[model samples]
Target chain A: FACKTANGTAIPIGGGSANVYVNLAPVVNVGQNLVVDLSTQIFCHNDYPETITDYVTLQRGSAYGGVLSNFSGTVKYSGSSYPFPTTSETPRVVYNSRTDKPWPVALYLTPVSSAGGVAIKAGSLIAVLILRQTNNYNSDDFQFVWNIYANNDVVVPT
Target chain B: FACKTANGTAIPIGGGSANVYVNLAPVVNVGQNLVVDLSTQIFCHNDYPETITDYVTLQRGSAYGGVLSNFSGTVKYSGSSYPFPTTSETPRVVYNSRTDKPWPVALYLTPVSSAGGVAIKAGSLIAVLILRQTNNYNSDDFQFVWNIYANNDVVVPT
Candidate 1:
């Protein structure tokens, strides 16, 4: 097939020949939302120098990208946590022709009175989170059971 | 007005009974999104107990107590490496409504294939973020700075 791996493998820049990092799980893999199963981290620039293979691979992830991360994060609360931005000024997640990662979300913030801040975490005295990046990776650092390298970025729960 | 501080004061838990960790920025302050200003770290549970104002504040950040802290992280690349998710992956930023410290976005990662993983400079890494929490206190960590707790998290350039 035209889809080939550098140095006979699927992954990031090789021999200074960079393309969108390969889908370590192979090209037509399922249940993978374009987010590649990175054998290692792929910087956006590493994805700059393109090849027909990379173009093909990019199409595969976005269009036939298979599926999204598939699950939502929390439930201790009684509602959905994602705002699903459409009407707001914030930008929605998008997959571009370049870059192996999603565009960075410009998060904003301000200060408030003490009581206003308190109610954010449901008074748990400890923060617990199951975070996911736009690139489709979850911190999945479930109590240190799965933090494989830079995959899961969860803080040790107190 | 309904917007009031703990014990009718301006900051932190007044009685030392911290509850649902504050958003520190009030759920829907007119000029603020649910984002927080953080110099360091925030504890989720710094907020404890319950109150009406807290509920209203909750309504502000999330979509009617819906969600917040929807964020992403970055990795570096190239002579001008773009902030790749590797360089990262789906990142999680934390906020402790009671403090003005934005829980430094804990960016986790690993070395790639032949690229020889290099360490990203915390100073070079830009902090371009879009965050919403499952709870609405992203702004909780605004104003304060000083989280010497974890070795896993670092602020970086995109």
Candidate 2:
């Protein structure tokens, strides 16, 4: 898998049998908006496009504690609607709090009314993760533990 | 080589022949201080620790277009003196700016007073890169191209 920066440089990444660590520090700076291009091939490998039935879950790595202070992320997929779901999550991503917890966020690819689900093929641009660092908070970095249920199977990338 | 977190989780890393990309985004947060424990084992694998004479250079990757905005870093080594030198660096790591350039920073482990350089053992905790994200800036992430002159030879880790 690879991540493309704004300047069109593709940073190739290898897959992991356990948790796939997506290192963002190489490109992450403060104040500027970070848009990372990610492909579906990184996670899923299928001969045909698979339909996503349930919602996708993105959580923080258990090893690192604390919230995503002063940081915000939006998952922009190919579809017209925003993939991320509105959350009433406690300890949500706040500005500067350290005690509060954030993340375990959710995103829905297809609308609730659409029973067919969203068909995403492998090796295609799955989504762009847009991240912003507002201010200096309690932590230095963050991670994502992704969960995706497609075609009635757990297809979360390792 | 590996990076140790505050919680003592060791994140293993593989070496690269060309530019070794060190991804920092996974452990970065705001409001609090971040102390990333990096070992010499990642960069150099010598039979014994060698003496470093010339100063070390850590610059932003050429492919990455901007400076390290809203960021400040200090190199804390095993020795008494701070490794990084005070530079009248232009476009330095400022709070918020898009036009100015930062980075291509320098660090000196051994003291100038000492004619012989300091000997850093392989596989030991050489330095702790203390980074602070003060505020938002123009760029999102950053990369480093390291150059170290040790043992009167080029010993920069791949």
* TM-score to native of every candidate shown: 0.20, 0.21
Per residue, candidate 1 scores C-alpha lDDT tens digits across B1-158 of 01112223222332121111222221231112223222122222235323211211110111101111222212211111112223222223333344333223332122211211122222222232222233243333222211111112222212
Per-residue lDDT of model 2, residues B68-154, tens digit only: 222234543332223232232122233222221222232322212111212222222222222222123223233222322111111
Could you give candidate 2's per-residue lDDT for residues A25-68 as a string of tens digits?
Answer: 21222223433323322222111113211112222211111012
- The 0-to-1 C-alpha lDDT of every candidate, in the order given, reads 0.21, 0.24
- Which regions of candidate 2 are displaced past 4 Å? A1-74, A77-158, B1-42, B47-74, B78-158
Looking at model 2 chain B, report the run of 10 residues with the lowest lDDT sum.
Answer: B149-158
Q: Which has the greatest TM-score?
A: 2
Candidate 1: C-alpha lDDT: 0.21
Model 1 residue B110 CA deviation (Å) reads: 2.5
State the DockQ of every prediction.
0.01, 0.01
